[PDB]
Paper text:
The mammalian glutathione peroxidase (GPx) family is a key component of the cellular antioxidative defence system. Within this family, GPx4 has unique features as it accepts a large class of hydroperoxy lipid substrates and has a plethora of biological functions, including sperm maturation, regulation of apoptosis and cerebral embryogenesis. The mammalian glutathione peroxidase (GPx) family is a key component of the cellular antioxidative defence system. Its eight members (GPx1–GPx8) catalyse the reduction of reactive oxidative species (ROS) such as hydrogen peroxide (H2O2) or other alkyl hydroperoxides at the expense of reduced glutathione and/or other reductants. Among the three different isoforms present in nature, the 170-residue, 19.5 kDa monomeric cytosolic isoform is essential.
In this paper, the structure of the cytoplasmic isoform of mouse phospholipid hydroperoxide glutathione peroxidase (O70325-2 GPx4) with selenocysteine 46 mutated to cysteine is reported solved at 1.8 Å resolution using X-ray crystallography. We successfully cloned, expressed and purified a fragment from Met1 to Leu170 of the cytoplasmic isoform of mouse GPx4 with selenocysteine 46 mutated to cysteine. GPx4 crystallized spontaneously in a 1.5 ml reaction tube at 2 mg ml−1 concentration at room temperature after acquiring the NMR spectrum. The first six N-terminal residues, Met1, Gly (added for the purposes of cloning) as well as Cys2–Arg5, are not visible owing to disorder. Overall, the mouse GPx4 has the same fold as its human homologue. With a root-mean-square deviation (r.m.s.d.) of 0.21 Å for 165 superimposed Cα atoms, the structures can be considered to be isomorphous. The active site of the GPx4 enzyme consists of the catalytic tetrad Sec46, Gln81, Trp136 and Asn137. In this study selenocysteine 46 was mutated to cysteine. The active-site cavity is surrounded by a number of positively charged amino-acid residues (Lys48, Arg80 and Lys135). All of the cysteine residues are in the reduced form.
Author numbering: 6 to 170
Amino acid sequence: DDWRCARSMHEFSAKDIDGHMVCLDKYRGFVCIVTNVASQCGKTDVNYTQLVDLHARYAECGLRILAFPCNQFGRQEPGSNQEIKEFAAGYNVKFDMYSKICVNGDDAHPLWKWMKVQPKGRGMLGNAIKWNFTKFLIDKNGCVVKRYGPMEEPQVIEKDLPCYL
């Protein structure tokens, strides 16, 4: 449980939604949105729609999106990885979908433990993830540069991208 001493997202690995383990150093050079998703949330439609749009408009400019399904917020992600994959398909998702994880507590994925402690990943009312669709913006070196809350629609991140692209 060495995660705290990591200096970059690129030191971490996670299982993609098809179960392949992926080393996140593949995102070196790319700016990344890392977000916790859910299918049965009141924010699901606006977030999937705008994330997909952003990725369509900025992938060639070096934007990548990592989506981590999580069922800790109102039980709004109850389905299997297979089902979640098909649900993301329904929104024409072409960014990267990961296997369902926890983001809070002792069994949280270590990337998520790490993000939450970074200087620009610190929360309001403590560091915990508060609800579905929190977003962290990660620079080309894998450092956290910003955190946006559940109610900050992905389009608000667009004005921040030229600082990093």
